[PDB]
Amino acid sequence: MSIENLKSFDPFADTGDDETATSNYIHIRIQQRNGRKTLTTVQGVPEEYDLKRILKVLKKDFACNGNIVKDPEMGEIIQLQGDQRAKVCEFMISQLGLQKKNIKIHGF
Protein backbone atom coordinates (compact mmCIF):
# COMPACT_ATOMS: atom_id res chain seq x y z
CA MET A 1 0.00 0.00 0.00
CA SER A 2 0.95 3.73 -0.54
CA ILE A 3 -0.50 7.31 -1.04
CA GLU A 4 -0.04 10.28 -3.47
CA ASN A 5 1.47 13.68 -2.42
CA LEU A 6 2.59 16.89 -4.26
CA LYS A 7 6.38 16.83 -4.99
CA SER A 8 6.84 20.53 -6.08
CA PHE A 9 5.14 23.45 -7.99
CA ASP A 10 5.98 26.30 -10.45
CA PRO A 11 6.32 30.01 -9.35
CA PHE A 12 5.36 33.26 -11.23
CA ALA A 13 8.37 33.52 -13.64
CA ASP A 14 7.93 34.13 -17.44
CA THR A 15 9.70 35.79 -20.46
CA GLY A 16 9.47 39.50 -21.45
CA ASP A 17 7.55 40.96 -24.46
CA ASP A 18 8.15 44.78 -24.14
CA GLU A 19 9.42 47.15 -26.92
CA THR A 20 10.23 50.93 -27.27
CA ALA A 21 7.40 53.33 -28.24
CA THR A 22 7.65 56.78 -29.96
CA SER A 23 8.45 59.97 -27.96
CA ASN A 24 5.80 62.60 -26.91
CA TYR A 25 5.70 64.50 -23.55
CA ILE A 26 3.35 63.44 -20.68
CA HIS A 27 2.69 65.42 -17.46
CA ILE A 28 1.64 63.76 -14.14
CA ARG A 29 0.56 66.44 -11.60
CA ILE A 30 -0.98 66.46 -8.06
CA GLN A 31 -4.24 68.39 -7.37
CA GLN A 32 -5.57 70.24 -4.30
CA ARG A 33 -9.39 70.83 -4.24
CA ASN A 34 -12.17 72.04 -1.85
CA GLY A 35 -13.47 68.41 -1.37
CA ARG A 36 -10.21 67.69 0.65
CA LYS A 37 -9.13 64.70 -1.57
CA THR A 38 -5.62 64.54 -3.15
CA LEU A 39 -5.81 63.51 -6.86
CA THR A 40 -3.24 62.69 -9.61
CA THR A 41 -4.01 64.35 -13.00
CA VAL A 42 -2.54 62.73 -16.15
CA GLN A 43 -2.08 65.02 -19.18
CA GLY A 44 -0.48 64.87 -22.70
CA VAL A 45 -0.74 61.03 -23.22
CA PRO A 46 -0.80 60.02 -26.98
CA GLU A 47 -4.35 59.69 -28.41
CA GLU A 48 -3.53 56.19 -29.83
CA TYR A 49 -3.78 54.94 -26.18
CA ASP A 50 -7.45 54.62 -25.04
CA LEU A 51 -8.08 56.64 -21.83
CA LYS A 52 -10.70 54.00 -20.77
CA ARG A 53 -7.93 51.30 -21.08
CA ILE A 54 -5.63 53.47 -18.85
CA LEU A 55 -8.52 53.48 -16.27
CA LYS A 56 -8.92 49.66 -16.65
CA VAL A 57 -5.17 48.94 -16.02
CA LEU A 58 -4.86 51.39 -13.07
CA LYS A 59 -8.03 49.92 -11.42
CA LYS A 60 -6.98 46.25 -12.11
CA ASP A 61 -3.19 46.06 -11.42
CA PHE A 62 -2.56 49.12 -9.14
CA ALA A 63 -5.99 48.80 -7.34
CA CYS A 64 -6.63 52.61 -7.71
CA ASN A 65 -9.81 54.48 -8.81
CA GLY A 66 -10.25 57.23 -11.46
CA ASN A 67 -12.20 59.00 -14.24
CA ILE A 68 -11.78 61.10 -17.46
CA VAL A 69 -12.49 64.82 -16.65
CA LYS A 70 -12.23 68.15 -18.56
CA ASP A 71 -10.55 70.86 -16.40
CA PRO A 72 -11.15 74.65 -17.07
CA GLU A 73 -7.33 75.26 -17.23
CA MET A 74 -5.67 71.80 -17.67
CA GLY A 75 -8.14 70.46 -20.34
CA GLU A 76 -9.19 66.82 -20.92
CA ILE A 77 -7.28 64.61 -18.39
CA ILE A 78 -7.47 61.38 -16.34
CA GLN A 79 -7.88 61.89 -12.56
CA LEU A 80 -6.68 59.05 -10.23
CA GLN A 81 -7.33 59.04 -6.43
CA GLY A 82 -4.27 59.84 -4.20
CA ASP A 83 -0.64 60.77 -5.09
CA GLN A 84 0.12 58.13 -7.79
CA ARG A 85 2.77 60.07 -9.78
CA ALA A 86 5.54 57.39 -9.60
CA LYS A 87 2.98 54.56 -10.20
CA VAL A 88 1.47 56.16 -13.37
CA CYS A 89 5.03 57.01 -14.61
CA GLU A 90 5.95 53.30 -14.18
CA PHE A 91 2.72 52.22 -16.06
CA MET A 92 3.58 54.40 -19.12
CA ILE A 93 7.19 53.04 -19.16
CA SER A 94 6.38 49.35 -18.39
CA GLN A 95 3.12 48.66 -20.30
CA LEU A 96 3.12 51.26 -23.15
CA GLY A 97 6.95 51.19 -23.74
CA LEU A 98 7.23 55.03 -23.54
CA GLN A 99 10.81 56.14 -22.69
CA LYS A 100 11.25 57.73 -19.20
CA LYS A 101 12.66 61.07 -20.59
CA ASN A 102 9.12 61.86 -21.95
CA ILE A 103 7.46 61.94 -18.47
CA LYS A 104 7.33 65.10 -16.33
CA ILE A 105 6.33 64.70 -12.63
CA HIS A 106 4.89 67.77 -10.81
CA GLY A 107 4.04 68.36 -7.09
CA PHE A 108 1.47 70.69 -5.39
Side-chain angles (χ1 to χ4, degrees), residues 34-102:
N34 70 282
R36 301 180 62 81
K37 289 186 176 183
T38 304
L39 306 172
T40 292
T41 39
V42 190
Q43 183 184 57
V45 63
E47 193 174 87
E48 67 183 278
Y49 302 113
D50 291 284
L51 303 183
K52 294 180 183 289
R53 181 59 176 274
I54 300 173
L55 306 200
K56 190 65 172 181
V57 177
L58 300 177
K59 292 182 190 190
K60 184 175 67 175
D61 291 277
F62 294 84
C64 297
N65 192 19
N67 290 287
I68 302 160
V69 180
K70 189 171 292 181
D71 191 88
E73 298 297 303
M74 292 190 185
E76 209 178 276
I77 56 190
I78 292 163
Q79 289 181 358
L80 212 68
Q81 292 199 128
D83 60 305
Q84 317 305 352
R85 57 189 172 83
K87 294 180 194 167
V88 176
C89 184
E90 191 173 87
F91 159 66
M92 299 280 171
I93 300 162
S94 176
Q95 301 300 282
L96 314 183
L98 295 169
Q99 300 300 281
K100 186 164 170 181
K101 65 177 66 178
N102 290 280

